[PDB]
């Protein structure tokens, strides 16, 4: 859980 | 979200859209595994609503989204509608989500975990950007 394959960018 | 920004598509893969039978987005939710979504109790979800997973742009028809029926709504019976306290519902899906690049689960904390005031977190959704 909790580890997106596509990383978020803020 | 007021004064946020567009997400990278697919980068919040637990985020779902709750849609009514007319296709109207009315609430968000989060996948916690392939069979269950966490949302707010006050969203008033019923088994006639739909969980939409894998979405980014609700105006696009070209995204491989999953429209998932809801088998049962489990409203936390500590929920207090007068104070909006204990505002959580679980949705048991009729058919499992298929996890992928763009669809996967958020972690849940332990009851004893500490998230300190001052910590910077993130919220996501398709709520209004201007009232």
């Amino acid at each position: 859980c909790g580890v997106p394959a596509i990383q978020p960018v803020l | 979200i007021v004064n946020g920004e567009e997400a990278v598509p697919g980068s919040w893969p637990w985020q779902v859209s709750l849609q009514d039978k007319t296709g109207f987005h009315f609430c968000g939710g989060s996948l916690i595994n392939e069979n269950w979504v966490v949302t707010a109790a006050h969203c008033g979800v019923t088994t006639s609503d739909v969980v939409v997973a894998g979405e980014f742009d609700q105006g696009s028809s070209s995204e491989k989204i999953q429209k998932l029926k809801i088998a049962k709504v489990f409203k936390n019976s500590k929920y207090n509608s007068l104070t909006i306290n204990n505002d959580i519902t679980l949705l048991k899906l009729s058919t499992a989500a298929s996890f992928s690049q763009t669809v996967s689960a958020v972690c849940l904390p332990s009851a004893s975990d500490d998230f300190a005031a001052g910590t910077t977190c993130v919220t996501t959704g398709w709520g209004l950007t201007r009232y």
């Binding site: - | 004064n3 707010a40 500590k78 104070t83 849940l108 977190c121 993130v122 919220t123 709520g127 009232y131």
Partner: protein, 97 residues
């Protein structure tokens, strides 16, 4: 009002319940956590979605978008269901069903 087609995000800080009570008074209960008052706000249609914090490399569900200012004011804290107060019920429900 403007509803977006595309998924939005914002980073925002957690408040203490004591400090959040300066805004919302006795409306704030132990099973709530406030966040924001920081130039962004959750708003109508965000309800039920996540407030996530990154801990040991993984995003963890700390809040569920719940309620707040009726105008989504960016200077007022938003109120979220506090998942640590609710997770035992989540686990019990999954185990029984």
């Amino acid at each position: 009002a403007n509803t977006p087609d595309r998924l939005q995000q914002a980073s925002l800080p957690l408040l203490s319940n004591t400090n959040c009570k300066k805004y919302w008074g006795t409306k704030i209960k132990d099973a709530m956590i406030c966040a924001g008052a920081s130039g962004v706000s959750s708003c109508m249609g965000d309800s039920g979605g996540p407030l996530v914090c990154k801990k040991n490399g993984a995003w963890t569900l700390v809040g569920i978008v719940s309620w707040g200012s009726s105008t989504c004011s960016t200077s007022t804290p938003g109120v979220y269901a506090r998942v640590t107060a609710l997770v035992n019920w989540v686990q019990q429900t999954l185990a029984a069903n």
